[PDB]
Amino acid sequence: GLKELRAVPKADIVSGFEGAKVCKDVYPKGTDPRGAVVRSTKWPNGSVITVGLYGGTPYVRSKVKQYAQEWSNYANITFNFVESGTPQIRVTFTQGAGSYSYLGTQALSIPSNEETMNFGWFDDSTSDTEFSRTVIHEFGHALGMIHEHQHPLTNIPWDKNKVYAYYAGYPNYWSKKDVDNNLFATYSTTQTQYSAYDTQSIMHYSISSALTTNGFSVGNNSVLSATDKQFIATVYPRN
Ligand SMILES: [Zn+2]
């Protein structure tokens, strides 16, 4: 099969946040997160992207493959799930590390012994809606999509000490200061790649109830929205 990736240090997986459903923004070391937008990170149109799955049960691995390929109904892009070589997208299932993917072709800047995507909370009992939501969302990032997030009406009620502890773990290794600029300041304003915000978007950024004092952390958006479908077709046209 595939060559083993280097393992996540288990000391850097933060205890107590098992099951906390956090999608983490991630970028190749030293790059500017503001530059990682779909017009810059999109794959060559018509690409067939090789994907490798590392670990996971056969059931979870089948679910990843099932829902990742939903994007190809609308985008002129195909995922080829392979078991040899160095795949372009490398998916791990490290429990407790959150879920994340590098954006678009930024995956190609990741060392070949490291993962480019992680699913941190799936198990064999996970619901179909949660598989659909999280897998389509993360492969959205893999196509270059960023989070959709509308301007907060009221400041997010961050449980700041739970947050500082969580983002100190792998893979960000963020300081107190790092969280203040990259997380708090980022989501204090609108984040969007659409001309108008789409409350139904699969790319909606949900903030975990493990990281806040109140509010509803699980939105409705578990399938591609009409805007998701229309936009991804303009990025990757059948041309
Ligand atoms: Zn995300």
UniProtKB/TrEMBL annotation:
UniProt modified residues of type N6,N6-dimethyllysine: 21, 42, 65, 176, 229
MF term (GO), any: zinc ion binding
Record-linked PROSITE patterns: PROKAR_LIPOPROTEIN
UniProt-listed CDD domains: ZnMc_MMP_like_3
Keywords (A to Z) from UniProt: Metal-binding, Zinc
SUPFAM superfamilies for the chain: Metalloproteases ('zincins'), catalytic domain (SSF55486)
Binding site for Zn(2+): 23, 137, 141, 147
Protein name according to UniProt: Myroilysin
Protein's organism: Myroides sp. CSLB8
